[PDB]
Design a binder for this molecule. Structure first.
Ligand SMILES: CC(C)[C@H](CO)Nc1ncnc2[nH]c3c(N)cccc3c12
Ligand SMILES: [Cl-]
Length: 167
């Protein structure tokens, strides 16, 4: 039993909700919140901008130190950093950004990072400003993640389309 509320169960291990991941994180304080990161951990917009703003820029400060030490992530890769006031940990995961020309086949690799964590709150990787089809992102998630994932979809209209079209 966990503290997530109001989710629709899609499969054994995947759950979904129309919600703002920032407000959802601030209420559940999950062990792991997933950020829709880029390789530079520059949290400017989209989910990353909203998560970082909610931490009063502490996420960005921590991230800049991480990059200065380790260099950029790989597309499809991840790193674990602090969750600040939102969660115990933040798993920064780099989905391919279609608006940069990155290979959508890397979306599966990106979701594989979730399997290193028993339970996660997450957005749909590569959705929104990363330019991928969210219906495809949800499909890859369901077919790749084996751990317990609670997906937050900010747009109420998009959520209903994902549910009604889910196979
Ligand atoms: C990945 C997309 C399919 C999805 C579209 O809804 N992105 C989000 N999902 C969940 N929560 C989100 N919060 C946001 C805030 N605060 C600012 C900007 C974007 C989001 C967002
Ligand atoms: Cl987003």
């Amino acid at each position: 039993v966990n503290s997530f509320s109001g989710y629709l169960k899609l499969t054994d291990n995947v759950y979904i909700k129309n919600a703002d991941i920032v407000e959802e994180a601030k209420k559940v304080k999950p062990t792991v919140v997933v950020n829709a990161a880029n390789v530079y951990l520059k949290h400017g917009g989209g989910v990353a901008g909203a998560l970082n703003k909610a931490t009063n820029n502490a996420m960005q400060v921590e991230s800049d130190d991480y990059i200065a030490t380790n260099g950029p992530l790989k597309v499809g890769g991840s790193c674990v950093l602090s969750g600040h006031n939102l969660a115990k940990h933040c798993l920064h995961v780099v989905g391919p950004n279609v608006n940069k020309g990155e290979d959508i086949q890397l979306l599966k690799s990106a979701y594989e990072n979730f399997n290193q964590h028993e339970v996660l709150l997450a957005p749909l990787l590569s959705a929104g400003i990363f330019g991928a089809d969210p219906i495809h992102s949800l499909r890859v998630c369901v077919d790749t993640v084996r751990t317990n994932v609670y997906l937050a979809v900010f747009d109420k209209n998009l959520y209903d389309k994902l549910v009604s079209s889910f196979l």
